[PDB]
From Swiss-Prot:
It catalyses: iminosuccinate + dihydroxyacetone phosphate = quinolinate + phosphate + 2 H2O + H(+). Catalyzes the condensation of iminoaspartate with dihydroxyacetone phosphate to form quinolinate. The lineage of its organism: Archaea, Methanobacteriati, Methanobacteriota, Thermococci, Thermococcales. It is an enzyme of class 2 (transferase). Its cofactor is [4Fe-4S] cluster. This is Quinolinate synthase. Belongs to the quinolinate synthase family. Type 2 subfamily. Contains three domains displaying pseudo-three-fold symmetry that each contribute a cysteine residue for ligation to a centrally located [4Fe-4S] cluster. GO terms for cellular component: cytoplasm. Keywords: 4Fe-4S, Cytoplasm, Iron, Iron-sulfur, Metal-binding, Pyridine nucleotide biosynthesis, Transferase. Gene3D superfamilies: NadA-like. [4Fe-4S] cluster binds at C233. It comes from Pyrococcus horikoshii (strain ATCC 700860 / DSM 12428 / JCM 9974 / NBRC 100139 / OT-3). The keyword Kinase does not apply. Pathway: Cofactor biosynthesis; NAD(+) biosynthesis; quinolinate from iminoaspartate: step 1/1.
Amino acid sequence: MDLVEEILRLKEERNAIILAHNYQLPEVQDIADFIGDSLELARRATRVDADVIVFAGVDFMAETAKILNPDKVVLIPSVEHILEAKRKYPNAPVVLYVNSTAEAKAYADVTVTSANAVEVVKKLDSDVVIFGPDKNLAHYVAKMTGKKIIPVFTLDDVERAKKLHPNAKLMIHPECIPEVQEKADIIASTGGMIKRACEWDEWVVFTEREMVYRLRKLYPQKKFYPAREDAFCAITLKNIYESLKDMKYKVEVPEEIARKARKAIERMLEM
């Protein structure tokens, strides 16, 4: 059958929109109504203009879209440590990376993505911030904001990369360990990488390999080398079709939890 044509018919029949993350397969990105990083996706999902959202991304972000649209259908194609940290730091605000459970977000004062972690944390009064669960992003934030660190790819790849592409600059994700972050020409979320790619003609990409295809698509003239070229490698176009055909893998979040996480996420967007 023709998957593209079937998905197009079902999108209309179900009154659905397809949102894709930057790491999705080219075939999935090609069928999406919008592609972006977590922040860009949260914004697009706000007050969504459809009855159904097919979210081609990780489970925790599909939950974010659901939390933001409690009365809409969200389909995905495929805790104690916080309270303890809070008891030791009663006045410190809790900042949770979107890469976390909805339940965890319920304990957060505000959430962050890789693109806005620095901005949001700098706007928090407290000089001490509880931040989790990604330790590497926590280090990046600590270094960029100068606040207290209340947490809750290797150098060989960098060298091999420089050896093969001497004139290429490096795009490194804040999720990479500190050592690598230090060697970066630019540190950014996938959304940031796309925005700043115009700053050079050749780039070595330190993030998921699928991002290379996204960048080549947006900048056909530039050269994008994956961090580990020789390394061999997911939601498929067929999964997208089946998702719409069977309305499956509905994403749900208990009201109590959802209400609290929603306050943290909507605050993130305002900040």
